[PDB]
Design a protein around this ligand. Structure first.
Ligand SMILES: *[C@@H]1O[C@H](CO)[C@@H](O[C@@H]2O[C@H](CO)[C@@H](O[C@@H]3O[C@H](CO[C@H]4O[C@H](CO)[C@@H](O)[C@H](O)[C@@H]4O)[C@@H](O)[C@H](O[C@H]4O[C@H](CO)[C@@H](O)[C@H](O)[C@@H]4O[C@H]4O[C@H](CO)[C@@H](O)[C@H](O)[C@@H]4O[C@H]4O[C@H](CO)[C@@H](O)[C@H](O)[C@@H]4O)[C@@H]3O)[C@H](O)[C@H]2NC(C)=O)[C@H](O)[C@H]1NC(C)=O
Ligand SMILES: *[C@@H]1O[C@H](CO)[C@@H](O[C@@H]2O[C@H](CO)[C@@H](O[C@@H]3O[C@H](CO[C@H]4O[C@H](CO)[C@@H](O)[C@H](O)[C@@H]4O)[C@@H](O)[C@H](O[C@H]4O[C@H](CO)[C@@H](O)[C@H](O)[C@@H]4O[C@H]4O[C@H](CO)[C@@H](O)[C@H](O)[C@@H]4O[C@H]4O[C@H](CO)[C@@H](O)[C@H](O)[C@@H]4O)[C@@H]3O)[C@H](O)[C@H]2NC(C)=O)[C@H](O)[C@H]1NC(C)=O
Ligand SMILES: *[C@@H]1O[C@H](CO)[C@@H](O[C@@H]2O[C@H](CO)[C@@H](O[C@@H]3O[C@H](CO[C@H]4O[C@H](CO)[C@@H](O)[C@H](O)[C@@H]4O)[C@@H](O)[C@H](O[C@H]4O[C@H](CO)[C@@H](O)[C@H](O)[C@@H]4O[C@H]4O[C@H](CO)[C@@H](O)[C@H](O)[C@@H]4O[C@H]4O[C@H](CO)[C@@H](O)[C@H](O)[C@@H]4O)[C@@H]3O)[C@H](O)[C@H]2NC(C)=O)[C@H](O)[C@H]1NC(C)=O
Ligand SMILES: *[C@@H]1O[C@H](CO)[C@@H](O[C@@H]2O[C@H](CO)[C@@H](O[C@@H]3O[C@H](CO[C@H]4O[C@H](CO)[C@@H](O)[C@H](O)[C@@H]4O)[C@@H](O)[C@H](O[C@H]4O[C@H](CO)[C@@H](O)[C@H](O)[C@@H]4O[C@H]4O[C@H](CO)[C@@H](O)[C@H](O)[C@@H]4O[C@H]4O[C@H](CO)[C@@H](O)[C@H](O)[C@@H]4O)[C@@H]3O)[C@H](O)[C@H]2NC(C)=O)[C@H](O)[C@H]1NC(C)=O
Ligand SMILES: *[C@@H]1O[C@H](CO)[C@@H](O[C@@H]2O[C@H](CO)[C@@H](O)[C@H](O)[C@H]2NC(C)=O)[C@H](O)[C@H]1NC(C)=O
Ligand SMILES: *[C@@H]1O[C@H](CO)[C@@H](O[C@@H]2O[C@H](CO)[C@@H](O)[C@H](O)[C@H]2NC(C)=O)[C@H](O)[C@H]1NC(C)=O
Ligand SMILES: *[C@@H]1O[C@H](CO)[C@@H](O[C@@H]2O[C@H](CO)[C@@H](O)[C@H](O)[C@H]2NC(C)=O)[C@H](O)[C@H]1NC(C)=O
Ligand SMILES: *[C@@H]1O[C@H](CO)[C@@H](O[C@@H]2O[C@H](CO)[C@@H](O)[C@H](O)[C@H]2NC(C)=O)[C@H](O)[C@H]1NC(C)=O
Ligand code: G28
Ligand code: G28
Ligand code: CA
Ligand code: CA
Ligand code: CA
Ligand code: CA
Ligand code: CA
Lengths: 388, 388, 388, 388
């Protein structure tokens, strides 16, 4: 109809209720489910769907051998109905590639897929299910993007990309697209020293992205974008409640403009809702691996370097595998506010479970409630032994 | 379009004709059919569909082992086209949880799924395929609901929930929802002493629910709701034709306001159409287990404590497994009256057939005819031996 | 929109071109294809689909054992996209039963399914995907119907049923339905002595049905219906080119009002287009079994007792299995005339191929061309050996 | 809505970006994927889809044995969503046959399938999913057509057919259809000496077809059609960069009106975009077999007999199997020009990989970019060893 505009603020998050879960690996043990990773959730005005990067093979198929690898010519961004698994028969390919993002602007959807060898990748921007724009690698070192949904405001849908090293300074750019065409792009600015896989959401005409400093920081870099002025700033979450993984143990004081040191060259896609006292951070429970998952209310996390949790909710037990996590919201729901939501990728297989030769995942997602709901834990649920 | 209003009375039930049957277990022996239980049927203005609580695995899948258990994080309310089986590829997830209800109000559908551990469950009310309201457990003991469709009148869709013990007095509430938001709730009143899994239908602006007294009664509690005044009453079916299971043998006189004693702490979801002389009761044939199924015309059952059958029809032979049964009607059909319909859950597997490690079911449903039709029996039809 | 009216005459049939083929048994050897029989084809104003009576099991499934039997509680009328196979995932159940018919009147579709034990069957008439009318068995001996599409004219859709013996006189009725309700019914009249499985088509406000005299005739009975006056007549195809199976060898002179003797108590559903010189008959090649299939132009077959073929076309080689055949046309196509079409059921399995324990079929269908096209033969194509 | 008219010229081709890839053989190793060959891509105003000639069996099915053969009664033109594989459950049959073409005219689609024995084939033209016209074989020697999409302009959709020898002069015709009816047909004229499988595209009211001279030429014949005057001309691509396969090595000078000699009686469906300096040719890398695939910019190829490449892009490595290739464009995209696109058929199985008894393929397709994008290679990706 008309372009959606971020006119509401966030609903108060007092707890998280279950939204979707596909139990993909469980079901896929005996049905035609595609091997995936790097999933996310994204809504259209009339439907919300699961998204992920297929590996071009089923979990039980012999070609599932080797799916731990990230970039091949057999990957593609696919979407399928909420809470269903990604099967060969219900998955809709949005585009071909090994890195992506996607978002609906109110009129139609923009999907971006990047493909290519490490030194010659290229992004192709799709709008209304048609290829419209292409961007060639600028640093010739794995051009890559969010791996979660982008956000639009009056037709402008900014997207963060990084090209260059993952263990040293790199070339991050913020592209502002409208109808799949480039309106403008900026280099990254602010104090964030390295950006990877930004998780974004929008409220009151401002887009907030919590990303991953793969180089030095265990605290998360944040990129706040103004989609009208088409400008942005960058810093880190000030809070000592560190949310990357692997990471050191929490200090009593965090860092606002530098990576918090302790772990180099590694991390995990993650997210947060930074909204004054209505601030919640997601993180793996384990400081060593992608194990477990919890949400912690840390009032003023973004700007208070001594902020510690005041409430929390466990999502996945530390005795269960987790993985990537990102934000999305249904900007077309009824009501006066935007209900924050997120998904957690539950990785199964390699490298942690090497008795199988594949790597895949299932998805669990939650959204906020103004009630103070009881909590449950949501594991993947598959028994690796069955796949042997 | 506009909210549907219960303006018609029931059509005269002179017999039952076959409506739908999915032969799920038969077909699922060699195809991707999800393991389910607690099924039901529910209509939209333009389509009637089968519903059930999937177990997040196929019947032939190795994860089918253990599906006798009721509540896990892998369950979800799913719906699929009438008479098809619930397959991985045609099942649409309505929400995540191990207890549910769903109904269309004329404009759109409301689905409710409850999930959580025993002492911390929570219900989330979905409307127009979006999460709108959440209710936390009030007795901290398996918050649960109907397991069959709710009914709406002018936007108000009442739903009965129970929280607390299943073998002692509990906390039952009647929630009146409109567009997924709570208009009001009451505590249970009347003479029913315990309520579980209400089966409901509506006619002439009154909603009747036949439920399950799991604690002491073998006769069924009935909750009649006024969706305009948003008030209700409760009693038991007066008739000596006892309809719960397990149950004692039929007496010559029933009880109108107390459970009929003889069997404690057990039962089965069931239903009835209470309409003066046009009154029909459904019950398993066996007084000991969920075996067989029949419909009996017992004029004035609800209010006559000596009422005995005047006509009847066998649905499932006592030499075949049955299970839950509930009511639904197509409130958007043509004609001057509402055609009563019901479904019977045909449980296969555990606990009665323990040579297999799973528990699932198929569905058979009938609707009334003003003709006096010949009868046939409708078993599940699968040979357990094939699954060994 | 508005009720379709049979306003056109038939196009001239100079040959037959391929229309649809699903290769169901071939494909089903390694995919989830339902076991079927008694197929047909039927069009809506915007789509033409294949129809058949599923057996409630896949061909490879263990429950495929025993599918030679005709009537069970696991059968249902299903429809699926043209030329696809009937799979568990694309088949749409129209109703439950072991005998059926279906037709679109221009506004919506009427489907009829009969179910029940031999002495207590009942038909239920569905309209707009809802149950509307029910008819109980009148002779208590396998109430049954066409097994191919019915035809409508201005809302009136006549259907022929038979109840009673298949090897002696029986009670055949012509029901005239409108919006799924009975407008009127007649007993069979005319000289046909026994009617089974009528194949019908309509042109210029007249409905012609070529049926099966299972009792004594090897020539085919024809029922011509006037859907406006709601009256009909009956006779046999006068032609010596006998078209039932099994049958005696062709004589030089046929019979116009009596069964042509030679074979008792057996036959096969078949059809014909009786249109003066534009008359074509379909028949198995073998006079002994359902083997092969050909179309023969026999000018004035219906009324000329010495009529012999003037042109012909082989459809299935006598070295391939055939089966039922029936008529249908797309009454919503463009043009000034109705293009005659038919389907041939290609039965595989029992009783002729007893190395397998199942019985199923695939479908091939053709429509007429005003060209004189070259011919090909269209067998099922599956290798039974593969199923062993 | 209204007939589409070829009003735009081609966009400048500076490189090729990935458009679609289905990884069919990879996925099909463990899922219900139909065996195919002779694929292509074609768009409707609201969707672009993959097309191919199914073999009426799955790749893992036992009937996959023998699929190297071209013409059987089990083949059919099917279409399925972009980048999905052709599965039994998502494939839509357009018509039955072993040779085809298809195109949307702006209002609806025309599909043509030819079937029959070698000496008696017949084409049937479908429009709006209905059979409208039939053409009988004129040379009685494998009537055949494009195997890729046709193009329309103001309702007129020309199609090239050939009937007669594949190793000697034959009878090629250009049919001009409108709404599936024949407006006119011509015999082939110009200097092309033999035509097979034309690959076409349209721009500025002119349709260009690059075909295959199976008889003597290693250079490609080109047929330029005027869909308004309904006339055409024919010649060969003048360029010494030879693009058929097998073929001799490139000379320094090509031939404009005669086949370039060196290889007789063989070839492969291929294509090109002839547009002055914006001219790009596709060809297998190997001069001996269907191995590898590249795009070469050869300014003025069609008319300059000494034209050699000025830029290029590898699509498939010479160490990977390729096959047929053809053109298509999305004539309903936004923008001022038509973005050239093509697909390459990646044949797997027989005859080159005879350890398996089948022959099938997957599809990769690209479209042009005005950017100068980095290149990647796109192989089928399946491991034959897994199928053993
Ligand atoms: C029914 O449902 C309800 C609803 O969910 C259940 O009630 C909930 O219970 C939750 C668990 O108790 C509770 O969550 C906790 O909230 C704490 C904050 O509340 C308390 O403090 C505030 C502030 O003073 C008070 O106002 C309030 O009244 C409470 O006293 C959080 O602090 C908790 O998180 C911390 O603990 C968990 C383990 O329990 C850690 O995993 C988590 O990371 C937090 O602790 C680490 O991080 C801090 C901060 O840096 C460190 O200080 C600390 O040492 C830990 O650090 C180590 O661990 C981390 C992670 O491994 C590592 O990185 C680091 O390096 C160190 O090794 C927790 O979130 C809910 O708020 C509460 N909800 C509600 C509405 O009440 C109820 O129990 C259920 N009922 C039943 C019967 O089960
Ligand atoms: C073709 O189709 C038609 C249409 O279906 C077939 O005709 C139908 O035939 C049915 C079976 O005969 C018949 O159903 C019965 O109706 C009886 C009522 O009708 C009779 O009584 C009335 C009233 O006086 C008369 O007007 C009428 O003319 C008849 O005489 C029911 O009473 C029957 O139900 C009872 O019996 C069945 C077993 O047959 C039990 O399973 C059932 O539970 C009922 O009996 C128990 O319950 C009562 C009540 O408390 C007890 O009194 C009794 O002792 C039994 O109790 C034991 O069993 C229960 C259950 O296990 C247990 O809980 C308890 O503790 C005790 O152990 C039955 O419903 C249809 O009405 C009739 N339909 C029509 C239209 O005619 C026709 O036969 C078919 N044709 C052919 C050729 O097959
Ligand atoms: C390319 O394509 C074209 C187009 O299809 C091919 O040309 C077609 O060729 C067909 C086969 O030759 C031909 O079909 C035949 O037509 C005959 C009628 O035409 C002839 O007679 C008329 C009338 O005088 C002449 O005008 C005309 O010019 C011809 O001379 C039919 O009579 C044929 O049917 C009979 O034969 C077939 C076997 O070939 C039987 O299976 C069939 O049942 C018919 O014969 C039985 O029935 C009659 C009638 O009672 C009996 O008299 C006879 O003895 C047979 O009876 C026995 O068999 C039956 C069945 O088993 C059994 O019940 C009974 O008891 C007895 O045992 C046949 O239909 C097409 O018309 C023709 N089409 C066109 C447009 O030309 C062309 O060949 C192809 N090209 C190539 C190179 O292959
Ligand atoms: C990141 O991405 C970019 C973008 O893709 C990569 O850059 C691209 O690199 C490509 C490969 O180098 C390049 O493609 C080549 O372009 C050549 C033309 O450019 C050159 O010449 C022009 C004209 O003078 C200059 O302007 C220009 O500056 C260059 O100097 C083509 O000629 C190449 O094709 C020929 O070679 C390939 C093998 O490399 C053959 O397979 C192909 O068939 C061509 O050669 C045959 O055909 C010719 C013509 O008849 C014969 O002369 C020759 O002998 C060969 O003939 C034999 O082989 C054929 C086929 O087997 C056989 O039939 C025959 O009988 C003989 O046996 C090639 O297309 C892109 O243009 C370039 N793109 C851009 C934008 O720059 C970059 O490298 C990537 N980065 C990294 C780090 O990898
Ligand atoms: C989001 O904001 C823009 C205004 O920036 C709205 O756009 C106006 O919409 C009306 C009807 O579409 C036009 O007549 C105005 O010219 C539009 N645009 C501008 C950019 O001035 C848009 O409608 C808003 N979105 C929604 C859902 O209300
Ligand atoms: C069910 O009843 C309500 C009346 O209670 C009907 O609502 C009225 O509908 C018309 C058109 O929608 C409005 O102009 C009135 O204001 C509506 N409502 C009220 C609540 O007064 C409703 O239309 C009835 N449903 C149907 C199908 O007729
Ligand atoms: C088939 O015939 C009936 C006439 O018998 C047509 O019905 C008339 O249609 C118009 C518009 O629907 C009405 O105003 C007339 O009253 C209708 N009916 C009768 C029964 O008189 C019908 O429209 C015809 N069908 C088609 C497709 O033209
Ligand atoms: C393609 O060209 C034809 C003109 O040749 C356009 O046809 C005219 O369309 C309008 C509205 O459809 C009619 O009133 C004219 O009579 C039409 N036709 C002719 C053939 O004169 C057609 O609309 C053009 N297509 C598009 C998409 O614009
Ligand atoms: C002619 C109809 N009769 C007699 C009942 C048949 O047995 C039909 O025969 C056959 C048959 O192949 O001849 C298949 C049908 N499934 C049967 N119909 C019913 C209702 O069972
Ligand atoms: C050039 C067309 N010819 C000669 C008939 C071919 O044999 C085609 O070749 C090939 C081929 O791979 O070269 C595949 C097509 N399936 C064939 N077409 C037909 C109709 O069989
Ligand atoms: Ca399988
Ligand atoms: Ca880090
Ligand atoms: Ca009880
Ligand atoms: Ca007979
Ligand atoms: Ca050649």
């Amino acid at each position: 109809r008309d372009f959606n505009n971020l006119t509401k603020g966030l609903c108060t998050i007092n707890s998280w209720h279950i939204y979707g879960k596909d139990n993909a690996v469980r079901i896929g043990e005996d049905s035609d489910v595609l091997v995936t990773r790097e999933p996310y959730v994204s809504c259209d005005p009339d439907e919300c769907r699961f998204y992920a990067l297929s590996q071009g093979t089923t979990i039980r198929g012999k070609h599932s051998n080797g799916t731990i690898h990230d970039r091949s010519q057999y990957r593609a961004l696919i979407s399928w109905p909420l809470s269903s698994p990604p099967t060969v028969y219900n998955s809709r390919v949005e585009c071909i590639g090994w890195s992506s993002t996607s978002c609906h602007d109110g009129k139609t959807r923009m999907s971006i897929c990047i493909s290519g060898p490490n030194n010659n990748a290229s992004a192709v921007i799709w709008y209304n299910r048609r290829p419209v724009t292409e961007i060639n690698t600028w640093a010739r070192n794995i051009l890559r993007t969010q791996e979660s949904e982008c956000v639009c405001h009056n037709g402008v849908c900014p997207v963060v990309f990084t090209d260059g090293s993952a263990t040293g300074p790199a070339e991050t750019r913020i592209y502002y697209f409208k109808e799949g065409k480039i309106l403008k792009w900026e280099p990254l600015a602010g104090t964030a020293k390295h950006i990877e896989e930004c998780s974004c959401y929008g409220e009151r005409a401002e887009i907030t992205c919590t990303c991953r400093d793969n180089w030095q920081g265990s605290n998360r870099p944040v990129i706040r974008i103004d989609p009208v002025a088409m400008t942005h700033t960058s810093q880190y979450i000030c809070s000592p409640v560190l949310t990357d993984n692997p990471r050191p143990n929490d200090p009593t004081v965090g860092k606002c403009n530098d990576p918090y040191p302790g772990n180099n060259n590694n991390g995990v896609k993650g997210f947060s809702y930074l909204d004054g006292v209505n601030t919640w951070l997601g993180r793996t429970i384990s400081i060593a691996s992608r194990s477990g998952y919890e949400m912690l209310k840390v009032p003023n996390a973004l700007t208070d370097d001594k902020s510690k949790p005041t409430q929390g909710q466990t999502i996945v037990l530390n005795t269960d595998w987790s993985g990537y996590s990102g934000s999305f919201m249904d900007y077309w729901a009824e009501g006066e506010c935007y209900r924050a939501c997120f998904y957690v990728e539950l990785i199964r297989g390699r490298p942690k479970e090497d008795k199988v030769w594949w790597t895949s995942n299932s998805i669990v997602s939650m959204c906020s409630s103004t009630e103070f709901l009881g909590q449950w834990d949501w594991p993947d649920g598959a028994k690796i032994e069955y796949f042997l």
